């Protein structure tokens, strides 16, 4: 089977550099041009660069020319993207993709046909910071016809991701853990909520388990009416 | 560059119905136009190339058509695994290789009004100098909803952010969180904090509110 495995994404500060690799198997590597294509959070696909099957020719999206360099090593079935002078707008999942065979001559097809799993590049000036965890307490204003809502606000952390479970993972029914939002501070914040019977606020315990590995933050917050 | 315009942004349909997706080009690409499918967390998968040729393992219900500046992808009868985002891509005139902005094919269900809940800031957060007020819109359909924050009846702008879940895998609804963020000093200058929700499933907009410090 055709296999493409990208690596090298990570958190990087503006102006600094990162190198992506994509290892390939299951086809004749030197018969195919190779592409990088990226996808910013919540946005569509944007082509980045291509390199010819023999590695002697390449092309670039205008917005990365002079900053990114694409290359390949046919002896190692590996594709590279050297990313220099990084900017916040470069934040995206980067996919490596082979294109279809076009023939024996110096040709491109321009038809991506197999894609890897993507590697995430996050460009930010922010420093590592653990979240504060605040209760979203159930009350008169979070009760509707026998249903109460409660949750945890996980505020001001960097970088992604955080994990949130409820009652050590035993409670998933009714749980919504929202996508994090990036604040103007450069820090992330998210909410995790659960709806439960209002009759259960005194008979059941609800604890959100928040984990942020980059800061070694592990918080278990009991949420009280 | 050749710019590709996809429409509609969202197609809301039920399993078994036909989906027709449009891709238009800013100038002729001949027949050099491809379509991809992408599910959340996953890489794109090639479906169609050269306007109408099916790629490996693509079932017959997917069909591509068009030439010049006018193209369509048709799914004759939607299966559950077909609800995803679809992108077109041209290879006639490049670099750059260009992609359309994508069309989401989502599951249609009956209209469902949101349950609305409001959460004042915690005492612990207020001690730290910040106030986050959270408004929760739970289990609604369709996705379109308007959240307006009012502070002593003054409509707020620029000081809230919202987040929406992916369509629930078993009831096909969405949930939405809106957070109003103020300094503790600014938060204590006002009394009534209100979240006003407008949604097709409500006969009239719903307000949830509280008196600060109550």
């Amino acid at each position: 089977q055709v296999q493409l495995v990208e690596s090298g994404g990570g958190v990087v500060q503006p102006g600094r550099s990162l190198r992506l690799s994509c290892a390939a198997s299951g086809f004749t590597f030197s018969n195919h041009g190779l592409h990088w294509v990226r996808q910013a959070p919540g946005k569509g696909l944007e082509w980045v660069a291509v390199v010819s099957k023999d590695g002697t020719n390449e092309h670039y999206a205008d917005s990365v020319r002079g900053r990114f360099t694409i290359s390949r090593d046919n002896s190692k079935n590996t594709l590279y993207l050297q990313m220099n002078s990084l900017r916040a707008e470069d934040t995206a999942v980067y996919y490596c993709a082979r294109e279809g065979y076009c023939g024996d001559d110096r040709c491109y097809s321009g038809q991506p046909d197999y894609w890897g799993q993507g590697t995430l590049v996050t460009v930010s000036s922010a420093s590592t910071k653990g979240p504060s965890v605040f209760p979203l307490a159930p009350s008169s204003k979070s009760t509707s016809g026998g249903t109460a809502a409660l949750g945890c606000l996980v505020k001001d952390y960097f970088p992604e991701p955080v994990t949130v479970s409820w009652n050590s993972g035993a409670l998933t029914s009714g749980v919504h853990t929202f996508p994090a939002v990036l604040q103007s501070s450069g820090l992330y914040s998210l909410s995790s909520v659960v709806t439960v019977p209002s009759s259960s606020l005194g008979t059941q315990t609800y604890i959100c388990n928040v984990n942020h590995k980059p800061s070694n933050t592990k918080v278990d917050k009991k949420v009280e009416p | 560059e050749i710019v590709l315009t996809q429409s509609p942004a969202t197609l809301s349909l039920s399993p078994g119905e036909r989906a027709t997706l449009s891709c238009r080009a800013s100038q002729s690409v001949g027949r050099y136009l491809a379509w991809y499918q992408q599910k959340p967390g996953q890489a794109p998968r090639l479906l169609i190339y050269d306007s109408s040729n099916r790629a490996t393992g693509v079932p017959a219900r997917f069909s591509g058509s068009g030439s010049g500046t006018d193209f369509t992808l048709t799914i004759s009868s939607l299966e559950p695994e077909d609800f995803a985002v679809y992108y077109c891509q041209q290879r006639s005139h490049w670099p750059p290789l260009t992609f359309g902005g994508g069309t989401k094919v989502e599951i249609k269900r009956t209209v469902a009004a949101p349950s609305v809940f409001i959460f004042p800031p915690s005492d612990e957060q207020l001690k730290s100098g910040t106030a986050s007020v959270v408004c929760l819109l739970n289990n609604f359909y369709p996705r379109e909803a308007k959240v307006q924050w009012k502070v002593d009846n003054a409509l707020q702008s620029g000081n809230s952010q919202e987040s929406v879940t992916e369509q629930d895998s078993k009831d096909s609804t969405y949930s939405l969180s809106s957070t109003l963020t103020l300094s503790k000093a600014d938060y204590e200058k006002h009394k009534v904090y209100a979240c006003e929700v407008t949604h097709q499933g409500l006969s009239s907009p719903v307000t949830k509110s509280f008196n600060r410090g109550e």
Binding site: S52, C102, Y108, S109 | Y32
Partner: peptide, 12 residues
């Protein structure tokens, strides 16, 4: 076996 796609860009 590999599909043969038309050439859309050349180099030299």
């Amino acid at each position: 076996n590999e599909t043969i796609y038309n050439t859309t860009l050349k180099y030299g």
